[PDB]
Design a protein around this ligand. Structure first.
Ligand SMILES: Cc1cc(/N=N/c2ccc(S(=O)(=O)Nc3ccccn3)cc2)cc(C)c1O
Length: 126
């Protein structure tokens, strides 16, 4: 199997804005996660070809990753903070669906997700 195309990151037909929450999501949340020691599995789409995971996109129908999220933020692709938060949650969920408890990658996801949730608890006002 081929990899699916990556998620769209730009769309001139989708309205754009910058909000304090979206700024925080890029500058604090994304950037903090991105530099973490456990970020590497999550910095780009899962390359099921390169990793020889033929079933990955048979199981995961809503792929998402931080590279995509970063580009969406940088492109002002999101209108609502919740769209971005949802993308992060989808990314984590995919990991938990595909992988098993105690797998290194699941422990990595848990740790990154705990940091993510901590940071979104600090989202500034609307
Ligand atoms: C979310 C997710 C990621 C993944 N594999 N991801 C990668 C990402 C990057 C590399 S890397 O080889 O470019 N960089 C590395 C590889 C190992 C340690 C540090 N950096 C390898 C696997 C595999 C699975 C199932 C999965 O559910």
């Amino acid at each position: 199997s081929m990899n699916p195309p990556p998620p769209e990151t730009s769309n001139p037909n989708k309205p754009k804005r910058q909000t304090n929450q979206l700024q925080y999501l890029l500058r604090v949340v994304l950037k903090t996660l991105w530099k973490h020691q456990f970020a590497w599995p999550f910095q780009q789409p899962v390359d099921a070809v390169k990793l020889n995971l033929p079933d990955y996109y048979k199981i995961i129908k809503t792929p998402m990753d931080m590279g995509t999220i970063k580009k969406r933020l940088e492109n002002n692709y999101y209108w609502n903070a919740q769209e971005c938060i949802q993308d992060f949650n989808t990314m984590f969920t995919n990991c938990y669906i595909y992988n098993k408890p105690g797998d290194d990658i699941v422990l990595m996801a848990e740790a990154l997700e705990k940091l993510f949730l901590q940071k979104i608890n600090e989202l500034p006002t609307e």
